[PDB]
């Protein structure tokens, strides 16, 4: 049947269209303060762990309150970080997508450190500008730290990004930079300049334990993307998975029946499915009529339209004519 | 990082988990109606221009009320190919997925031939229980020709199906066939034995010529594919592709304006994309209320819930403490 | 393209008939419009596709 | 004045202009398998020749 | 700057226009400002482009 084919494409009858270019990039916002928490309390235990190595040289500072000061030390590690981290993701984002360069990534900034542990030197390789395959939309997501980024000179008041307990400390970073890298037991690895990120912090994290992954394993992630997803065990981006949501139900007082995993009676029926599925329930318990039901009540004292937007991975045929149909047929069983 | 991988696989933290087996079954009823005249449409332009070889045979049986011999011809071949084609499904899904046989298909039939045409041949290859990969759910779809049959033995007044113009004749199908099979002009081909199809049927048809793929290209479908659903210049089953659903707009009396693909305002935003996409609107007349918000009205003289169902490819964390946080993270940096 | 395609039918229709045996058989199944004799039909059929190409290949 | 309907198709003002795919088809099958007829493959070169240019008087 | 740009939209639709059967699905989704056509927008937002790297490339 390739004669044909190959007729239906010389013709662009047929064909592989699509609306979107290939690493179409989508900008998501990261949580880059959840994050910031979960990395700090995991720190501290570290630093904890080989405290003797620690408690002379944190003597010259003192804790902001009654914070203790393994979590002072891995507040402004983790801050530095971060600071760092703007910057590797906007010289990724000058190889790949300079547009993004020219919208969120053109002020420039140097980074405190090229080295980390090998964890953070291993989120500074992933949280970058990743690729997404064989979703209906062929994806580059772009991580962003911060929609506006509230820059600053003295280092001391620093906080670009919005995070509470955000502190940079130079003196206190780079004595503890020497004394990881002094130590035998805490290791440091350069960071790797590579563009294209890993999908470790794109899971969609739900209701108890339940961490989805909205894209196909093949191609895009292997089990130590997981593993990132770990140890950070928090949620790193929004929720970006596909969801198949029913029709609003309405109630005048808060008898709201509790959302039962007994699968409470949805509406309408289902029209998409996965293997892994995840039923949440979304309240308003003060949402007023629009504006158009009032009217109709109003002159009372109704049509109803819908916009679908069906996405697809691409578009096959592109001009169906009878004739090119019969010289395909004509062609295959003649 | 793949030591901490492999501790968090042994220790069954993160996984593949998965709620759904691999080929999920799924029954899509076929339109069968549709095909049966696209079919014999564009079969018996194929028949009137090789006449010559079918008008001495055809001399002995009469067209029903005004349909010319070709078309006549053609409907008793596409009949029989349809007949036959229920077989095929049948015995495909006796093997795999027994137990849509015996729900779909038990009723035995004994089919006509076992040599059609190049082309009818592919199509009897193609519309078994096809195998999609990589959408969210793993499926197996099975074509469903009808849900109900009305058998009877009567060859004459046989039509299992729905379909109006539904021909069946022996004398005349053996002795078309015979004069394919020793005609050089025509080609026939063997029907294979194979259990899996292709997903030539089951493409998304839209108002234009926008035929969609809700699948990926890779693993599912090659072009020949594409070229056998330009052939059947109709739809083969209906729209089985996701949408990104709006909001419900509300109006008096029909006095909507008119859909804009120039894109005319949705309510709410986007949250899922493709590479591909198409709008549409979808009109109710006559609308009530929900009885609950009629009740709220009278009791007039807003809270709201919804249910969300997020479907996903696997559950990739399973079980997550800060235990073993913290174990697979010392195994990396220390 | 007018008088061309009048010469050219009836150069062909002269062709057609003298073959006539081999195209009475198939063309029996269709009709001509008033009082075209077939092989004058055929002729105009075969030159109205011809021109219908030679619009494509001079594109 | 372009159209779609193959039956009504008259992309030029030609009077007995017919398009008919069937016949088209059946012909050029009989045309094929008939050794008393040739067939020739349309070429693909961009210039022609002056066959069509000359200038026609009155005798 | 402005002329360059316009002389070189002129030159590059009708490249476009010539291989168009190409661009006449990509472009469906686009809508042209006016009654431009689609390959004079075709040709202005890449000769746009081309300016907007201009300026980078002398920088």
């Given at each position: 049947l390739?004669?044909?084919?190959?007729?239906?494409l010389?013709n662009?009858?047929?064909g592989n269209?699509?609306?979107?270019y290939?690493k179409?990039?989508?900008?998501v916002?990261?949580?880059?303060?959840?994050?910031?928490?979960?990395?700090?309390?995991?720190y501290?235990?570290?630093?904890?762990?080989?405290w003797?190595?620690?408690r002379?040289?944190?003597?010259?500072?003192?804790?902001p309150?009654?914070?203790?000061l393994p979590?002072?030390?891995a507040r402004?590690?983790?801050?530095?970080?971060?600071h760092?981290?703007?910057?590797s993701?906007?010289?990724?984002?000058?190889?790949?997508?300079?547009l993004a360069?020219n919208?969120?990534?053109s002020?420039?900034?140097?980074?405190?450190?090229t080295?980390?542990?090998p964890?953070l030197a291993?989120?500074?390789?992933?949280?970058?500008?990743?690729?997404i395959?064989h979703?209906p939309?062929?994806?580059?997501w772009?991580?962003?730290?911060?929609?506006?980024?509230?820059w600053?000179?003295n280092?001391?008041?620093?906080?670009?990004f919005?995070?509470?307990n955000?502190?940079?400390?130079?003196n206190?970073?780079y004595?503890?930079?020497?004394?990881?890298?002094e130590r035998?037991e805490?290791?440091?690895?350069?960071?790797?300049t590579?563009?294209?990120?890993?999908p470790?912090?794109?899971?969609?994290?739900?209701?108890?334990?339940?961490v989805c992954a909205?894209?196909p394993r093949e191609?895009?992630f292997?089990?130590?993307?997981?593993?990132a997803?770990?140890?950070?065990?928090?949620?790193?981006?929004?929720?970006?998975?596909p969801?198949?949501?029913?029709?609003?139900?309405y109630?005048?007082?808060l008898n709201?029946v509790?959302?039962?995993?007994?699968?409470?009676?949805?509406?309408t029926?289902?029209?998409?499915?996965?293997?892994?599925?995840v039923?949440?329930?979304?309240?308003?318990?003060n949402?007023?009529?629009?504006?158009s039901?009032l009217n109709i009540?109003?002159?009372?004292?109704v049509?109803?339209?819908?916009?679908?937007?069906?996405y697809?991975?691409?578009?096959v045929?592109?001009?169906?004519?009878?004739?090119?149909r019969?010289?395909?047929?004509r062609?295959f069983?003649?």
């Open positions: 390739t004669r044909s084919a190959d007729y239906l010389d662009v009858r047929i269209h699509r609306q979107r290939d179409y990039r989508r900008y916002l990261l949580r880059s303060s959840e994050i910031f928490t979960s990395l700090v309390a995991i501290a235990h570290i630093f904890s762990s080989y003797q190595h620690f002379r040289f944190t003597d010259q500072f003192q804790a309150t009654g914070v203790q979590t002072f030390v402004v590690y983790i801050s530095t970080w971060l760092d981290l703007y910057c993701i906007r010289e990724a984002t000058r190889s790949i997508s300079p360069f919208e969120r990534y002020y420039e900034l140097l980074p405190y450190s080295e980390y542990d964890f291993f989120l500074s390789m992933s949280i970058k500008p990743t690729h395959q979703t939309e062929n994806t580059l772009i991580p962003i730290l911060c929609e506006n980024y509230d600053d000179r280092e001391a008041n620093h906080n670009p919005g995070i509470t955000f502190t940079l400390n130079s206190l970073f004595g503890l930079l020497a004394i990881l890298k035998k805490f290791k440091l690895s350069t960071l790797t590579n563009t294209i990120g890993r470790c912090w794109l899971f969609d994290w739900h209701d108890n334990v339940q909205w894209f191609a895009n292997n089990s130590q993307d997981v593993t997803a770990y140890i950070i065990g928090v949620a790193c981006t929004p929720k970006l998975g969801s198949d949501d029913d029709a609003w139900k109630y005048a007082s709201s509790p959302t039962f995993t007994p699968t409470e009676p949805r509406l029926n289902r029209r998409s499915y996965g293997a892994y599925e039923r949440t329930r979304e309240t308003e318990n949402y007023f009529l629009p504006d039901l009540i109003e002159d009372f004292t049509i109803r339209t819908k916009i679908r937007d069906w697809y991975h691409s578009r045929i592109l001009e169906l004519e009878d004739n090119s019969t010289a395909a047929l062609m069983i003649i």
